[PDB]
Amino acid sequence: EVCAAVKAFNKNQVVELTERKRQEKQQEQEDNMTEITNLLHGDLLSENPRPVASSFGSHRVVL
Amino acid sequence: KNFINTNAADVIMGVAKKPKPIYVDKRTGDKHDLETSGLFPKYINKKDYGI
Amino acid sequence: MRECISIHVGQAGVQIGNACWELYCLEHGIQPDGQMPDDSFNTFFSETGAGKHVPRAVFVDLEPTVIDEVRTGTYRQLFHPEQLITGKEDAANNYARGHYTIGKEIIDLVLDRIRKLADQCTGLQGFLVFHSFGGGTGSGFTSLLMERLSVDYGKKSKLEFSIYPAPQVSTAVVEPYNSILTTHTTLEHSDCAFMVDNEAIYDICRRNLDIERPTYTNLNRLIGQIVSSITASLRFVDLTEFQTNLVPYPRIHFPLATYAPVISAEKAYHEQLSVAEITNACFEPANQMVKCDPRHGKYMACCLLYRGDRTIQFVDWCPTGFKVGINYQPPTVVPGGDLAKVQRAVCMLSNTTAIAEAWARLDHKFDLMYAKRAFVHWYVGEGMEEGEFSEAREDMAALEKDYEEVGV
Amino acid sequence: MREIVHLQAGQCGNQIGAKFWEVISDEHGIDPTGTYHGDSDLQLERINVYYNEATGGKYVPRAVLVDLEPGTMDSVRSGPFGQIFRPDNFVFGQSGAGNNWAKGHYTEGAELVDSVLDVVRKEAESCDCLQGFQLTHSLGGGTGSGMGTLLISKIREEYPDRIMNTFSVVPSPKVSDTVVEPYNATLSVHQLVENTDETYCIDNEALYDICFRTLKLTTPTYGDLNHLVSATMSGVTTCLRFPGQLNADLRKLAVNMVPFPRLHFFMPGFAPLTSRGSQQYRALTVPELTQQMFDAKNMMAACDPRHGRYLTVAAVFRGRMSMKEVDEQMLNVQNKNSSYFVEWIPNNVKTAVCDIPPRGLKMSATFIGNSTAIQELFKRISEQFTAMFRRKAFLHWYTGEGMDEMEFTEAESNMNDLVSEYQQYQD
Amino acid sequence: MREIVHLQAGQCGNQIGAKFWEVISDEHGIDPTGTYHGDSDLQLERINVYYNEATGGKYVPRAVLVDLEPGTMDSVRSGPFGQIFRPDNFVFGQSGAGNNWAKGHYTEGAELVDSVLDVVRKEAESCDCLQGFQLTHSLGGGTGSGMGTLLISKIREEYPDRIMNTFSVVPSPKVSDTVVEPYNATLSVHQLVENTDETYCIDNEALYDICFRTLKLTTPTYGDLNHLVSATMSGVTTCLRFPGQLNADLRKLAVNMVPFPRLHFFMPGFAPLTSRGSQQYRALTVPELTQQMFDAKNMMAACDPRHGRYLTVAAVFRGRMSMKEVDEQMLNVQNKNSSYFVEWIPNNVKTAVCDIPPRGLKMSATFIGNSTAIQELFKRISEQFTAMFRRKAFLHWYTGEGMDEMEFTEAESNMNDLVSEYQQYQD
């Protein structure tokens, strides 16, 4: 009986550990998507010319 | 050149290959070397030992 | 009346003591606030008249950014705010900074708080010092602490739990200089130093448990289990009989450590864990906590701590070599931990001849550096003479011939 | 409570610093006014390492901006982040150095060090425990090299137990834009060997190489080479501000890569540098950081580490990662290469792990390698210094400032011996 | 656990090996963008033999495309499945080989050989246990054969325990679209002798006999010939990817068919090739797969094994089928014929059964045979090399590239002994 409830607790714990592993893998894929989306939106790889705009005015640029 | 005689002579007058010792740890075939892990006694054989 | 003052020096000490004190809180009823929602906590806790329970520990570091997380974490209300001692600048992997220049700013404060903690306890068994050989503070300030504790606290037990440097992996370049210059000055000032290294616990957490890529917390929890199994007979043998039954000669105080069932909850269902199984699994070289092998040496002593319900060859002069202790409380599972729930466990502390290869490798790497005088200017300029390298090396030469002499 | 004072000289040191401070302020949530607009509590916790609190919640940097002409103090003041700098910290003279070392060291810069040392003695007294200084300057100019190595010699006599990093832009033989380059570079490497604790060597032909073959930029400006440098400049101070599992001071890195007191010229690198086309191919793990960190396409200096032994190596990781995987890749890169690592140092690589990644990344890393392939960098200078000086090509500018010819002879054998000093551990 | 790093060289080498990947990817259920859309798990459990993982559940092949001109590395990219490859693995030079074997072996392909052994080591040291490489090339061109033997000559020395398979397209006997063919092929078969574990021999003329006489197509093309090569490439390496009742690796065929180390030239084939109209009558049983492996019209080399003797025979069966009925037919052909089998090997046939069939078929079969009628190939290359080389015809297009005339004289006598080697296992 005591062996039975220890084995049942072990089986249940195996189910929760497997679900925790699945959850952290899916969260890793989410962070990968955030990685690549932010790096494509970044101005270094987009090369938008607006980064040459200067606070002094719209006629002068940053060298 | 007698290829049959030379092939036989090459495979009789020689030496055998000596493998690097490798031990498997897990049940899924994980392979590691032996002489650089801490198991087989290698570094007590040094001549500096105890002095 | 059976207290144990704990001292945690270094980042290794603080991050191990976090796991240890979480387990100590959960074994009794103590919430992380400090209130219980029986007096067996008295070996580790103090009962303020305002209902609060305060631990008997001192956390020391020369850097503030690993104690500030304890100060802002979940266990913020539990600790006395001045049982956590911090410096401003760390020791920077330098035994000289950690011994002579920086550690002298904190040694008096640590001794003051230790005296204040030891005045509460009626019957004090001894101290437990958690440290790491490789770091700056854990190698310099720890040795300075034992030097200034030997003259102050008598013939008390001074147990050490150390992270000995691993045989092939380390997180520093300058580690062997520390690892020899601390052993030379703690050889005569200690009673028993259980040594576990991180590489063997990585092997066990990969192999026994199925945790590929573990972090330090999965190691700190197993260390906490071993310390609880050592001290559990005070709460539910003593600390005092360990130094009698493990250290024959006064320089050979270096035993080992093992916990017998370290298995996952998806393989505790498949097997018995009877006393013969766990006793056999203590003496297996795959389950030791130092990457070494006691087949290639000779056993000298063994202490077997059971908890809950012709290959092994001994030395000539010690035929018996066994001390056995039995406790009745089974080990307690923490939520989020990785071990199973079990009814029986064993912790074996064994003194063996097969640790000579560790000192031989350490001396080899110290020689390899120091023959060409690398890194010496850092250690010389921080108030430390050069000749101490020569005395530490000839002293550890004497130690290797000691390990051969006793075996012969 | 381990504060860092930033010192920055020349046009090169003022245009690196305008981009470094543009990176730190994003990392701590500071807008161009100076008010904290962030979404954590870790950012505000140790902002005092670089920022001084003002009244009203403002934060101003602990930087001193020096120059010898007033022309580069206006483009800094007219950038996006130019209004956070305290206006007293701009110290600028009205007659330039003119690509001349001697005017920077004896005539013009010597009348300005006493008006800069007043400023740095004001930010050395706001710190409860000052860690050390920082200089960014160019070795190929006249006021980065004359005044800049005049300040270090005067700082190191007043704060002699601190830490004095530099980020030297050493001249390149290919990307070079001054005839009188090797006179200033020879007379300044002589001034860095006995007055710094660490000196990271940067060549501009190695930053163009990274921006052409790895990031694949069409037109890299100087603003895209100042972003490469400033990502390493905050990668070595990142455990002083954010917590971790295994920290590293700047002092702890001085201990482990300086075996002998004159061997402190390193080569930086930064791990996750990638294109915009290769962003969905990259797998974002720790072995991919380690493969790119050690790549010889990747070092920020123009000397190849396949021509010499690696004396010692660093690694300063960021992110939430596994200490088993961090520690098993430094062992892995060390056992295949038997003769790329020096024999009398058995473990060469020191690792540290911080816990907070840069803004917009998952994890990152940094490399600070000490090699005996750095002595080819001081021999292309020493083959062009001696081609000119054997006939006295340009000396009349230099002699007529109070400077003698004998200083061009003592700064030859004092760099001819450092090449032989790095040579004796090459084999 | 058993990886294969694909190499492919030339315009022949890339137009073969771009159709092979469309064959494999629909054998495993991979859409043109790279993701997985399949209805099994045997399609996915052994996919690591050929496919590196990418992010988001996307798989990229382990293929490296080398070439010496950028025109044929944009028809590959603009095909149907051309977007699955990682773009770094595309390697192309800027100036062609020019059908010149010297130009690709010594001059143009000796600086490109250093730039591809960076690529092939990043893909070889990322495998858990490397089984062995491949190659696909032609012995008539310049970059397939000149540089393409320089690769095998080099990466046998660095990796001498692994497997090096090749899929040669040796020159055709009848059709010849290059005058300077025989200098290419004679100088290349010497490099195949020492450095290669297995080599198949494919003639483009004997691919034309299949696609007209047997498959009965109105218009064949170089996609209906690159489907025949790829349907033999998949048959040798399908017991690595799919379970069977009896397995056969890439080693277990080379162990059995290569007795002596100089004799590794084989003769492929493929059994169920039937027309639309004749399909109603054909496609019956397992005796109709052993009938058409061994038919002498189906060989993919233009050399007939009736002229000589099968040293060793092999067969790889695909489909879920009877372990008895496979074994009874190989007993049936080994006993009816006597002088088509060598005397000193009494079990000349090795057999293998793979469960998962090819795409669209319910059963299939594949052949490899090893003959002493493969040495009529080299007696026809050497009849047209020393025809030309007697009066020194095209010699300046090779000698002015850095060769000499006695590199020719040894390379014919490095073929006029392997001809007379095979003539002594004749009797």
mmCIF file of C-alpha atoms in Angstrom, chain E residues 148-421:
data_model
loop_
_atom_site.group_PDB
_atom_site.id
_atom_site.type_symbol
_atom_site.label_atom_id
_atom_site.label_comp_id
_atom_site.label_asym_id
_atom_site.label_seq_id
_atom_site.Cartn_x
_atom_site.Cartn_y
_atom_site.Cartn_z
ATOM 1 C CA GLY E 148 37.463 17.558 -57.505
ATOM 2 C CA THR E 149 40.352 15.162 -57.154
ATOM 3 C CA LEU E 150 42.321 17.720 -55.177
ATOM 4 C CA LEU E 151 39.628 17.573 -52.522
ATOM 5 C CA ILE E 152 39.736 13.772 -52.182
ATOM 6 C CA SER E 153 43.533 13.827 -52.277
ATOM 7 C CA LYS E 154 43.503 16.264 -49.352
ATOM 8 C CA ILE E 155 40.685 15.118 -47.095
ATOM 9 C CA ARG E 156 41.757 11.545 -47.161
ATOM 10 C CA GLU E 157 44.867 12.648 -45.256
ATOM 11 C CA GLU E 158 43.001 14.655 -42.639
ATOM 12 C CA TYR E 159 40.257 12.023 -42.147
ATOM 13 C CA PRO E 160 41.741 8.616 -43.014
ATOM 14 C CA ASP E 161 39.360 6.333 -41.073
ATOM 15 C CA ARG E 162 36.036 7.587 -42.460
ATOM 16 C CA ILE E 163 34.268 6.656 -45.704
ATOM 17 C CA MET E 164 34.849 8.458 -49.008
ATOM 18 C CA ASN E 165 32.234 7.478 -51.568
ATOM 19 C CA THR E 166 32.148 9.041 -55.022
ATOM 20 C CA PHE E 167 29.626 9.070 -57.849
ATOM 21 C CA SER E 168 31.761 9.567 -60.918
ATOM 22 C CA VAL E 169 30.429 10.356 -64.345
ATOM 23 C CA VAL E 170 33.376 8.954 -66.286
ATOM 24 C CA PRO E 171 33.563 9.907 -70.005
ATOM 25 C CA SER E 172 31.250 8.255 -72.452
ATOM 26 C CA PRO E 173 32.607 5.891 -75.122
ATOM 27 C CA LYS E 174 30.424 7.009 -78.026
ATOM 28 C CA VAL E 175 29.201 10.554 -77.403
ATOM 29 C CA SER E 176 31.900 13.075 -76.548
ATOM 30 C CA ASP E 177 31.201 16.799 -76.249
ATOM 31 C CA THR E 178 34.812 17.833 -75.530
ATOM 32 C CA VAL E 179 37.967 17.215 -77.523
ATOM 33 C CA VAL E 180 40.219 17.582 -74.481
ATOM 34 C CA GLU E 181 38.330 14.822 -72.598
ATOM 35 C CA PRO E 182 41.059 12.130 -72.477
ATOM 36 C CA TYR E 183 43.673 14.252 -70.735
ATOM 37 C CA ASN E 184 41.101 15.046 -68.049
ATOM 38 C CA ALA E 185 40.065 11.453 -67.374
ATOM 39 C CA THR E 186 43.487 9.807 -67.593
ATOM 40 C CA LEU E 187 45.056 12.205 -65.112
ATOM 41 C CA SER E 188 42.138 11.811 -62.709
ATOM 42 C CA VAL E 189 41.750 8.036 -62.396
ATOM 43 C CA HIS E 190 45.163 7.810 -60.755
ATOM 44 C CA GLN E 191 43.917 10.065 -57.938
ATOM 45 C CA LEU E 192 40.857 7.832 -57.540
ATOM 46 C CA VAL E 193 42.978 4.725 -56.985
ATOM 47 C CA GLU E 194 44.756 5.700 -53.801
ATOM 48 C CA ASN E 195 42.299 7.977 -52.036
ATOM 49 C CA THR E 196 38.825 6.514 -52.441
ATOM 50 C CA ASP E 197 36.908 3.779 -50.617
ATOM 51 C CA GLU E 198 34.161 3.200 -53.205
ATOM 52 C CA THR E 199 33.594 4.622 -56.660
ATOM 53 C CA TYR E 200 30.606 4.120 -58.902
ATOM 54 C CA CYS E 201 30.905 4.529 -62.667
ATOM 55 C CA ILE E 202 28.051 6.244 -64.504
ATOM 56 C CA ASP E 203 28.092 6.790 -68.262
ATOM 57 C CA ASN E 204 25.698 9.360 -69.678
ATOM 58 C CA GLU E 205 25.322 7.232 -72.807
ATOM 59 C CA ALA E 206 24.032 4.269 -70.812
ATOM 60 C CA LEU E 207 21.582 6.578 -69.054
ATOM 61 C CA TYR E 208 20.267 7.454 -72.518
ATOM 62 C CA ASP E 209 19.668 3.792 -73.389
ATOM 63 C CA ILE E 210 17.408 3.337 -70.360
ATOM 64 C CA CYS E 211 15.325 6.481 -70.890
ATOM 65 C CA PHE E 212 14.548 5.651 -74.513
ATOM 66 C CA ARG E 213 14.416 1.866 -74.889
ATOM 67 C CA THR E 214 12.969 0.877 -71.497
ATOM 68 C CA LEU E 215 11.278 3.855 -69.804
ATOM 69 C CA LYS E 216 9.922 4.877 -73.252
ATOM 70 C CA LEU E 217 9.859 8.675 -73.041
ATOM 71 C CA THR E 218 9.253 10.931 -76.034
ATOM 72 C CA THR E 219 11.645 13.607 -74.728
ATOM 73 C CA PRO E 220 14.307 12.672 -72.197
ATOM 74 C CA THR E 221 16.197 15.449 -70.512
ATOM 75 C CA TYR E 222 18.894 16.090 -67.940
ATOM 76 C CA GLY E 223 16.215 15.836 -65.268
ATOM 77 C CA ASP E 224 15.174 12.398 -66.468
ATOM 78 C CA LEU E 225 18.844 11.449 -66.228
ATOM 79 C CA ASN E 226 19.378 13.101 -62.858
ATOM 80 C CA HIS E 227 16.385 11.173 -61.568
ATOM 81 C CA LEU E 228 18.090 7.916 -62.422
ATOM 82 C CA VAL E 229 21.306 8.813 -60.585
ATOM 83 C CA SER E 230 19.450 10.026 -57.498
ATOM 84 C CA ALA E 231 17.298 6.877 -57.370
ATOM 85 C CA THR E 232 20.514 4.881 -57.011
ATOM 86 C CA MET E 233 22.074 7.324 -54.534
ATOM 87 C CA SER E 234 19.059 6.810 -52.297
ATOM 88 C CA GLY E 235 19.163 3.035 -52.528
ATOM 89 C CA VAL E 236 22.666 2.552 -51.174
ATOM 90 C CA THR E 237 21.938 4.756 -48.148
ATOM 91 C CA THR E 238 18.412 3.719 -47.138
ATOM 92 C CA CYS E 239 19.279 1.188 -44.444
ATOM 93 C CA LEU E 240 20.842 4.133 -42.640
ATOM 94 C CA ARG E 241 17.550 6.042 -42.594
ATOM 95 C CA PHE E 242 14.882 3.340 -42.353
ATOM 96 C CA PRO E 243 14.589 0.123 -40.328
ATOM 97 C CA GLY E 244 14.742 -3.273 -41.958
ATOM 98 C CA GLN E 245 14.610 -6.994 -41.435
ATOM 99 C CA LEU E 246 18.237 -7.072 -42.550
ATOM 100 C CA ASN E 247 20.439 -3.971 -42.550
ATOM 101 C CA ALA E 248 23.332 -2.781 -44.689
ATOM 102 C CA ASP E 249 25.368 0.333 -43.939
ATOM 103 C CA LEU E 250 27.802 2.074 -46.257
ATOM 104 C CA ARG E 251 30.615 0.074 -44.661
ATOM 105 C CA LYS E 252 28.963 -3.339 -44.892
ATOM 106 C CA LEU E 253 28.885 -3.118 -48.718
ATOM 107 C CA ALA E 254 32.496 -1.931 -48.987
ATOM 108 C CA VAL E 255 33.635 -4.668 -46.607
ATOM 109 C CA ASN E 256 32.138 -7.325 -48.824
ATOM 110 C CA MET E 257 32.725 -6.127 -52.381
ATOM 111 C CA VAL E 258 36.253 -4.670 -52.092
ATOM 112 C CA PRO E 259 38.653 -7.557 -51.404
ATOM 113 C CA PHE E 260 41.910 -5.859 -52.488
ATOM 114 C CA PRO E 261 42.379 -2.129 -51.915
ATOM 115 C CA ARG E 262 42.939 -1.056 -55.537
ATOM 116 C CA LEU E 263 39.666 -2.460 -56.913
ATOM 117 C CA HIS E 264 36.684 -0.211 -56.080
ATOM 118 C CA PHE E 265 34.899 0.578 -59.352
ATOM 119 C CA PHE E 266 31.277 -0.532 -59.448
ATOM 120 C CA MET E 267 28.313 -0.740 -61.840
ATOM 121 C CA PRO E 268 24.918 0.505 -60.627
ATOM 122 C CA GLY E 269 21.375 -0.329 -61.779
ATOM 123 C CA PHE E 270 17.765 -0.069 -60.663
ATOM 124 C CA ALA E 271 14.992 -2.592 -61.068
ATOM 125 C CA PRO E 272 11.380 -1.300 -61.465
ATOM 126 C CA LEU E 273 11.571 0.996 -64.501
ATOM 127 C CA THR E 274 8.344 0.624 -66.473
ATOM 128 C CA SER E 275 6.371 2.684 -68.951
ATOM 129 C CA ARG E 276 2.855 4.067 -68.663
ATOM 130 C CA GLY E 277 1.433 1.701 -71.250
ATOM 131 C CA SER E 278 3.304 -1.402 -70.140
ATOM 132 C CA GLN E 279 2.503 -0.848 -66.447
ATOM 133 C CA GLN E 280 -0.780 -2.802 -66.758
ATOM 134 C CA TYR E 281 1.240 -5.835 -67.849
ATOM 135 C CA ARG E 282 4.334 -5.322 -65.667
ATOM 136 C CA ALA E 283 4.883 -4.725 -61.928
ATOM 137 C CA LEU E 284 4.123 -8.127 -60.445
ATOM 138 C CA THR E 285 6.436 -9.780 -57.884
ATOM 139 C CA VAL E 286 9.964 -10.239 -56.477
ATOM 140 C CA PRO E 287 11.105 -12.461 -59.415
ATOM 141 C CA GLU E 288 10.431 -9.310 -61.485
ATOM 142 C CA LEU E 289 13.001 -7.382 -59.461
ATOM 143 C CA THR E 290 15.831 -9.924 -59.631
ATOM 144 C CA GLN E 291 15.012 -10.207 -63.321
ATOM 145 C CA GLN E 292 15.792 -6.560 -63.913
ATOM 146 C CA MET E 293 18.651 -5.742 -61.601
ATOM 147 C CA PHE E 294 20.752 -8.355 -63.374
ATOM 148 C CA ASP E 295 19.600 -7.630 -66.918
ATOM 149 C CA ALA E 296 22.696 -6.523 -68.803
ATOM 150 C CA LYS E 297 20.849 -3.699 -70.558
ATOM 151 C CA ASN E 298 20.078 -1.935 -67.268
ATOM 152 C CA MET E 299 23.658 -1.241 -66.152
ATOM 153 C CA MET E 300 24.433 2.417 -65.571
ATOM 154 C CA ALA E 301 27.874 1.949 -67.122
ATOM 155 C CA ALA E 302 28.507 1.402 -70.826
ATOM 156 C CA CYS E 303 30.478 -1.778 -70.217
ATOM 157 C CA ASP E 304 28.879 -5.213 -70.368
ATOM 158 C CA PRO E 305 29.618 -7.828 -67.668
ATOM 159 C CA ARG E 306 29.291 -10.681 -70.181
ATOM 160 C CA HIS E 307 32.853 -9.879 -71.243
ATOM 161 C CA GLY E 308 34.223 -10.819 -67.818
ATOM 162 C CA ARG E 309 33.448 -11.974 -64.314
ATOM 163 C CA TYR E 310 31.586 -10.611 -61.310
ATOM 164 C CA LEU E 311 34.160 -10.385 -58.526
ATOM 165 C CA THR E 312 31.402 -9.524 -56.054
ATOM 166 C CA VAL E 313 27.702 -8.715 -56.384
ATOM 167 C CA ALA E 314 25.383 -6.677 -54.174
ATOM 168 C CA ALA E 315 21.661 -5.970 -53.894
ATOM 169 C CA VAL E 316 19.614 -3.625 -51.685
ATOM 170 C CA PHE E 317 15.882 -4.375 -51.654
ATOM 171 C CA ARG E 318 13.240 -1.795 -50.727
ATOM 172 C CA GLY E 319 9.708 -2.621 -49.663
ATOM 173 C CA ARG E 320 8.226 -4.850 -46.965
ATOM 174 C CA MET E 321 8.728 -8.289 -48.424
ATOM 175 C CA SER E 322 9.617 -11.908 -47.742
ATOM 176 C CA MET E 323 13.021 -12.816 -46.276
ATOM 177 C CA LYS E 324 12.641 -16.239 -47.912
ATOM 178 C CA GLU E 325 11.731 -15.085 -51.428
ATOM 179 C CA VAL E 326 14.619 -12.610 -51.538
ATOM 180 C CA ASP E 327 17.090 -15.347 -50.616
ATOM 181 C CA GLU E 328 15.772 -17.978 -53.022
ATOM 182 C CA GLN E 329 16.359 -15.862 -56.144
ATOM 183 C CA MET E 330 19.994 -15.002 -55.346
ATOM 184 C CA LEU E 331 20.561 -18.709 -54.929
ATOM 185 C CA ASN E 332 18.844 -19.113 -58.305
ATOM 186 C CA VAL E 333 21.157 -16.830 -60.312
ATOM 187 C CA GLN E 334 24.388 -17.866 -58.546
ATOM 188 C CA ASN E 335 23.837 -21.489 -59.571
ATOM 189 C CA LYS E 336 22.616 -21.281 -63.180
ATOM 190 C CA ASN E 337 25.626 -19.211 -64.291
ATOM 191 C CA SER E 338 29.183 -20.457 -63.828
ATOM 192 C CA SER E 339 31.678 -18.339 -65.766
ATOM 193 C CA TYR E 340 30.060 -15.034 -64.791
ATOM 194 C CA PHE E 341 31.258 -15.605 -61.221
ATOM 195 C CA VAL E 342 34.846 -15.783 -59.942
ATOM 196 C CA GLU E 343 36.024 -19.167 -58.769
ATOM 197 C CA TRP E 344 37.591 -18.253 -55.442
ATOM 198 C CA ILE E 345 34.491 -16.664 -53.886
ATOM 199 C CA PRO E 346 31.600 -19.132 -53.454
ATOM 200 C CA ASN E 347 29.015 -16.669 -52.061
ATOM 201 C CA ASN E 348 29.342 -13.641 -54.306
ATOM 202 C CA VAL E 349 26.019 -11.930 -53.449
ATOM 203 C CA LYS E 350 25.181 -9.803 -50.408
ATOM 204 C CA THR E 351 21.548 -8.930 -49.661
ATOM 205 C CA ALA E 352 19.647 -6.285 -47.701
ATOM 206 C CA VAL E 353 15.976 -5.570 -47.041
ATOM 207 C CA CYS E 354 14.638 -2.088 -46.293
ATOM 208 C CA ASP E 355 11.030 -1.624 -45.236
ATOM 209 C CA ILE E 356 9.934 1.860 -46.357
ATOM 210 C CA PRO E 357 9.622 1.872 -50.157
ATOM 211 C CA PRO E 358 10.441 4.642 -52.640
ATOM 212 C CA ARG E 359 7.937 7.370 -53.354
ATOM 213 C CA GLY E 360 4.937 6.187 -55.334
ATOM 214 C CA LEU E 361 6.111 2.558 -55.449
ATOM 215 C CA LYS E 362 4.975 -0.403 -53.375
ATOM 216 C CA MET E 363 8.236 -2.302 -53.893
ATOM 217 C CA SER E 364 11.604 -1.598 -55.493
ATOM 218 C CA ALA E 365 15.183 -2.844 -55.688
ATOM 219 C CA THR E 366 18.735 -1.598 -56.282
ATOM 220 C CA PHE E 367 21.988 -3.167 -57.509
ATOM 221 C CA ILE E 368 25.744 -2.805 -57.186
ATOM 222 C CA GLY E 369 28.110 -5.143 -59.021
ATOM 223 C CA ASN E 370 31.868 -5.390 -59.260
ATOM 224 C CA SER E 371 33.386 -6.647 -62.452
ATOM 225 C CA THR E 372 36.587 -7.462 -64.249
ATOM 226 C CA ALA E 373 34.711 -6.111 -67.248
ATOM 227 C CA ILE E 374 35.182 -2.609 -65.809
ATOM 228 C CA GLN E 375 38.757 -2.756 -67.128
ATOM 229 C CA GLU E 376 37.523 -2.354 -70.658
ATOM 230 C CA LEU E 377 36.763 1.243 -69.682
ATOM 231 C CA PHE E 378 40.418 2.099 -69.077
ATOM 232 C CA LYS E 379 41.625 0.332 -72.223
ATOM 233 C CA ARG E 380 39.453 2.772 -74.212
ATOM 234 C CA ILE E 381 40.504 5.905 -72.350
ATOM 235 C CA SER E 382 44.132 4.900 -72.857
ATOM 236 C CA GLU E 383 43.577 4.241 -76.554
ATOM 237 C CA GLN E 384 42.597 7.888 -77.033
ATOM 238 C CA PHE E 385 45.087 9.422 -74.610
ATOM 239 C CA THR E 386 48.213 7.968 -76.256
ATOM 240 C CA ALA E 387 46.607 8.561 -79.624
ATOM 241 C CA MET E 388 46.671 12.272 -78.857
ATOM 242 C CA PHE E 389 49.811 12.292 -76.697
ATOM 243 C CA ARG E 390 51.945 10.525 -79.333
ATOM 244 C CA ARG E 391 52.062 13.651 -81.521
ATOM 245 C CA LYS E 392 51.654 16.073 -78.622
ATOM 246 C CA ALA E 393 48.406 17.744 -79.724
ATOM 247 C CA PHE E 394 46.925 19.917 -76.958
ATOM 248 C CA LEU E 395 49.996 19.897 -74.730
ATOM 249 C CA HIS E 396 50.575 23.639 -74.346
ATOM 250 C CA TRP E 397 47.230 24.058 -72.586
ATOM 251 C CA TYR E 398 48.518 21.915 -69.732
ATOM 252 C CA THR E 399 52.306 22.361 -69.708
ATOM 253 C CA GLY E 400 52.098 26.148 -69.518
ATOM 254 C CA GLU E 401 49.976 25.839 -66.385
ATOM 255 C CA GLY E 402 52.886 24.403 -64.425
ATOM 256 C CA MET E 403 53.016 20.723 -65.288
ATOM 257 C CA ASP E 404 55.615 18.629 -67.078
ATOM 258 C CA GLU E 405 55.555 15.865 -69.666
ATOM 259 C CA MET E 406 56.554 13.033 -67.305
ATOM 260 C CA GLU E 407 53.525 13.663 -65.124
ATOM 261 C CA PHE E 408 51.681 12.383 -68.189
ATOM 262 C CA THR E 409 53.990 9.395 -68.675
ATOM 263 C CA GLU E 410 53.496 8.161 -65.133
ATOM 264 C CA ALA E 411 49.726 8.638 -65.236
ATOM 265 C CA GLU E 412 49.326 6.317 -68.191
ATOM 266 C CA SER E 413 51.528 3.729 -66.461
ATOM 267 C CA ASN E 414 49.381 4.256 -63.361
ATOM 268 C CA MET E 415 46.534 3.009 -65.486
ATOM 269 C CA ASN E 416 48.368 0.424 -67.569
ATOM 270 C CA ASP E 417 48.973 -1.535 -64.361
ATOM 271 C CA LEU E 418 45.444 -1.454 -62.943
ATOM 272 C CA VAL E 419 44.388 -2.798 -66.329
ATOM 273 C CA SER E 420 46.976 -5.558 -65.891
ATOM 274 C CA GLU E 421 46.006 -5.934 -62.239
#
